[PDB]
Nucleic acid binder design. Sequence first.
RNA 1: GACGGGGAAUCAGGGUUCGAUUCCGGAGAGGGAGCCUGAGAAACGGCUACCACAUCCAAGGAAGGCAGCAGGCGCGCAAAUUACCCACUCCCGACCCGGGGAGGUAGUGACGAAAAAUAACAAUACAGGACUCUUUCGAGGCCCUGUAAUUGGAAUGAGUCCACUUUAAAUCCUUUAACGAGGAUCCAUUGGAGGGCAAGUCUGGUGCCAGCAGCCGCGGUAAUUCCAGCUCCAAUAGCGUAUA
Lengths: 185, 141, 124, 193, 57, 49
Amino acid sequence: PVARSWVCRKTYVTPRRPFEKSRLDQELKLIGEYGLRNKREVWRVKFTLAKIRKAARELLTLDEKDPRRLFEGNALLRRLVRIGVLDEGKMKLDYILGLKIEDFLERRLQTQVFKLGLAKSIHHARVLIRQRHIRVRKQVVNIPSFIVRLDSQKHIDFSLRSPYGGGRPGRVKRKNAKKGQGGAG
Amino acid sequence: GKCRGLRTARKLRSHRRDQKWHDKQYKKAHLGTALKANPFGGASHAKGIVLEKVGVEAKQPNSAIRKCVRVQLIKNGKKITAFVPNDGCLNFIEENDEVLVAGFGRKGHAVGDIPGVRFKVVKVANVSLLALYKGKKERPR
Amino acid sequence: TVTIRTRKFMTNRLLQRKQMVIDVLHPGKATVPKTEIREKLAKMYKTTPDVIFVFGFRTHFGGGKTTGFGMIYDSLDYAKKNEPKHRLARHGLYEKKKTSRKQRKERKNRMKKVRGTAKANVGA
Amino acid sequence: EGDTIIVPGVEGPIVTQIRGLLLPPPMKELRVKNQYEKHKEVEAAQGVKILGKDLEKTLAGLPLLVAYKEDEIPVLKDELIHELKQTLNAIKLEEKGVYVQASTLGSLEALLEFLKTSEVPYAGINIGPVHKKDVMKASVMLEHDPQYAVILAFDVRIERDAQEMADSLGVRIFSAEIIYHLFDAFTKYRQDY
Amino acid sequence: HGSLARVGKVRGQTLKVAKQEKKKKRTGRAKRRMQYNRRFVNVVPTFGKKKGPNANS
Amino acid sequence: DSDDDRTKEERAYDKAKRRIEKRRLEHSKNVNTEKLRAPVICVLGHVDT
RNA sequence: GACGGGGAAUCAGGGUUCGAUUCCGGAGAGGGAGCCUGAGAAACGGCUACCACAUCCAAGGAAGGCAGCAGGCGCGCAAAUUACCCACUCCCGACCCGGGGAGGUAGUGACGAAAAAUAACAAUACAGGACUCUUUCGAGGCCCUGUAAUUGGAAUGAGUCCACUUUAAAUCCUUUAACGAGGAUCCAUUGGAGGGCAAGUCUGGUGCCAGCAGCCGCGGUAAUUCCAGCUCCAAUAGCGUAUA
Ligand SMILES: [Mg+2]
């Protein structure tokens, strides 16, 4: 009777058709456009979008003017406004189902780093996050699948320990300085 | 459904039970005679040691001989015939040597041109035949 | 430099000590040792530097914050009455016996194996 | 106790880890039943017993080595394999024959030398009590020349279920603690056959 | 010919050609980049039917 | 440069082997000629002796 | 091939299969039988006789039940340390103070779950897309897109290893030194390439032989399927196979 968690779930799903032309072309287009690593990421984004769509459909099939419908509908709309995939104009339950994988993919931290101008390419943004150069609200982030909120967009800048934004220079700078000192004598 | 009445569920349940019993897969999977006649005893893999190396030909359209091996199982002593899978692996297997033998992939039936046999050898002397094939590990001697 | 902002202060007249949570903000430095933060709590809370006990320091990701616990007692012997002994062993005010569990269990079983006065002499 | 040791065996060297140092009393010898002591460190010029977890096969009379380092890959024992390749007086000829069983390595060596001078090949060299697997391999050798379809067990007791599965189908076990009585029983069965 | 019950004649008579040294293949994330580039970036519009990626006819 | 072999795992065990050889040879250098170990007594004979 | 339930997998709607397994209730300590004490036991780390099995012995006798924690044998397709501590959660006792293989800690650990390295940038090299003009020759390349073993400085991580931190004592994470890459050799495998089903009628060898192939079928001295080299496709630290 040890005291552990024993709670876990799978965050992605595998399609029943492994070899189709249009599906593989679409996921390859998404991966090459937004600089992702493998198809497990877009599969997990499809999984969470399917979960959100299923929840919205389950709320829509329940009758109007009920407290549970209003509570979970307004909770879902406030949540998706807080992510930033919707605006206050389209604050409706039926407008949830007209979403796309694109709207969930624009809120990635890698996409925001490439879009604001910190990086030159989306893959350069990914490897720039991986070497701990990007911080937000005084906390460094080393992971590319970070979902930034709407209020957290304007806090994106370089870190206080990265040499790009002011700090100690890296390994190649000090080694080349020591090489220049050795060459100069 | 045929007998549709508001107070008719036992008749439907009993008829569905009988017609489900009068099947093939459900009758095989819910009777003990098939597992009594099963050499593996309802298991994926089984061990055994080699009696001799024999040879059996193929069927009518395909003309070749397939070199299976005669291994009896350790759980209950049933004498079966297992097909040595890949090319040139009959040199690696020896007489009176332990093997690990699994099925061939049709739930206990013959596959293609080989006659009657339904098992394949996976490992011999606790080393895999794939390692002896690809030149990745050498068998003890 | 490094500066200290105490958080979640409360007093405990039931047990004559002061509970608070100390967050250590050291931009560019490593993790602070417990002795030097004890001197900071001494020069901040106007008490003697041998009554304060600190533990539970946990660094954050990126190395800007380090939060943890720290306790200040009113007097030294009031701290000696009501405290776990291993923290005093960390702070050098306590000594504990260095005997392993299997030796003590074997000695207890061998003492159980005999009766009378010989129990006190069979186990050395 | 915190070290990695290597001992040679039938299938080359087998690397293991030490478990306990079983020492007899100084008044007594190693041939005593269930009376030893446990130690952490043992001094030189002593006769100790080594316990392992998975060795099961060991040719004695060979050196061993202890490494204080991290032995992550078996390349360090090339000199041990080189020593094993020379002075092989007891060549382990593994053919199809009599499954022979003995309690100790010396008894097994004496029994295989007796079968060698009796001009009969031997199949199994298992060490320990007689189980269902040894009797079953004798039952396997009951096909394809069933003359060598017996179990020779010396100075050991067999299991009851092995006896039951043996005499359910006719496997002879000449279990005897006296080695020349075992020899006389074996040659009597050979002449009767 | 020799015999028919011999095994591995084709494997024992194969002209053994060793592998030649080649540059290592990019893996992880860059392989998806190269596949996306070579399949969707530098392609020319083509009529009729599209040839495969290994149609060496 | 060119100092070691073409690989690293091939030269990884060579330093350990030469360290074992030097620590063995040093173990044959500083030895004690007084208060030695115990000899081994080897009893042989015939049947019923 | 039945401990029961709370539950698990798949699932449009209905269903099908499993539930030995951490929480609840029940049963047993080889298997039947009987009992003392005690509030509460037909108790087995209590006792008494039977059989199966089994230990020591001067042979008269004496002593036991790991379906507890580690460990060993057998059985097997199939499952780990003959470790550290009562500091945390509680429990027993005359009780701040003693004890707990109940537990907590680390080791083994590709059952399984989550995050995520094996590269990015810039200039001539060479094929083109956007813009009127030179029908066709070629030019702003100021704006690019790509890749062939041309090059250049800028980066940080695995790892080695002071310290700090954690902890009963440690280990690991995080922090932090000094070192730590250009074929960044600090080199990614597992399957497949006739159709189903994404991807060569490429090049050599055997010639219904060896073999491949879940199914159709492929092998007959020009094999898009065997065996090897190059290229390519699939998923990616994961992939193939056998079974319910
Ligand atoms: Mg004698």
